[PDB]
Amino acid sequence: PEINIKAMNQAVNTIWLLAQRQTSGIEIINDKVKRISLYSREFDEMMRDSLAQLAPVLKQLTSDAAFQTIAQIDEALADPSLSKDDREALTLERNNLIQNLSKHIDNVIVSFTGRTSKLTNKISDISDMVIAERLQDLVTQTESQKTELQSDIDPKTEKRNKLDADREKIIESQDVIRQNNIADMFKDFIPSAKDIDGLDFTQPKKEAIKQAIKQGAEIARKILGKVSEGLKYIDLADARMKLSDQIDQLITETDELKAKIREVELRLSGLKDVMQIDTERTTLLTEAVKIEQVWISFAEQLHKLSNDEINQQDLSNLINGQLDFLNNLTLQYNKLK
């Protein structure tokens, strides 16, 4: 049964990473993620240690003293010139040694099962953990909010364009007024249509100037709400600057909405990270379950051999196969480093 420890350790590490770099503000999810990352790191360390620790326990069984001794007992029992008292004594020695070997194998199975059981309990601590209920709905809510924020932003850009166009018209009027120094001719109030129309330059020049000045004045009065008859230059300049400040108000609003979009997108990223955490957890848990099943089958077969007696060679093949397997896993672990 081939197992990929590389994927297991890489999933553990990615889980830790994503927990470290998760940006979603939910306190519950943050706490749960921290807990699961700690459980996974504890499990990685405990697995490394369990592999390094288990091989000696099984190794002790193969080099059991009682086996060569049993052989020597049988050798002695091969002698015909022996008393039935001594024969039964040696027979009891052999049978007792078989009983001690079985007892020792059971003690080994208990120790091995305990070591594996601690890992199993940690795997259970990991699996039982639930990050959040129906996360996909949370992601849906977050993306819906992001869409709503963008849809509320777009009209702000359109309105900024309209006010900027109005500012352009107003400042055109101001700069052209100074260009022709009209302020000096009509210093008290803006010249009416007839007043400017009566004198100077060309009818195209006159008409262009009139349209520009009237456009500026109309926009200014509309912004300030006063009627056209006010005809004051100061009203024009005041409206210009006041509309510009309103544009700055729009900039403030837009910056706030952009910051909220930043938070929402950051959150969505965090949630995606949590989903990837769950996926990597699944990846890890699959390999862990495979190793657990391997070890349980091994323990069952070893219990079967304990129930049966002697049969040293097949037992050695079993234990050595398991040791080679453990060494394979340890080698796989060491390779990644």
Author numbering: 14 to 350
From the paper:
α-Xenorhabdolysin is a PFT that has been first isolated from the bacterium Xenorhabdus nematophila. Xenorhabdolysins are also found in other entomopathogenic bacteria, such as Photorhabdus luminescens, and human pathogenic bacteria, such as Yersinia enterocolitica and Proteus mirabilis. They are composed of two subunits, namely XaxA (45 kDa) and XaxB (40 kDa) and are only active when the two components act together. Xenorhabdolysins, which were suggested to be binary toxins, perforate the membranes of erythrocytes, insect granulocytes and phagocytes and induce apoptosis. In contrast to previous predictions, XaxAB is therefore not a typical binary toxin, but rather a bi-component α-PFT.
XaxB also crystallized in orthorhombic space group P212121 with a unit cell dimension of 89 × 99 × 194 Å and four molecules per AU. The diffraction data of XaxB was processed with the XDS package and SeMet atoms were determined using the CRANK2 pipeline in the CCP4 software package. The four XaxB molecules in the asymmetric unit differ considerably in their tail domain. Especially, helices αB and αC that protrude slightly from the five-helix-bundle take different positions. Although this might be due to tight crystal packing, it also indicates a certain degree of flexibility of the tail domain of XaxB. In contrast to XaxA the head domain of XaxB contains in addition to the central coiled-coil a helix-loop-helix motif, dividing helix αE and a 21-residue long amphipathic helix (αF). The highly conserved hydrophobic face of helix αF is oriented toward helices αD and αG and thereby shielded from the solvent. The conformation of the head domain is stabilized by conserved hydrophobic as well as electrostatic interactions, including putative salt bridges. Interestingly, in the case of XaxB the tongue is formed by an amphipathic helix, while XaxA does not contain such motif. We identified two hinge regions that facilitate the swinging out movement of αF in XaxB.
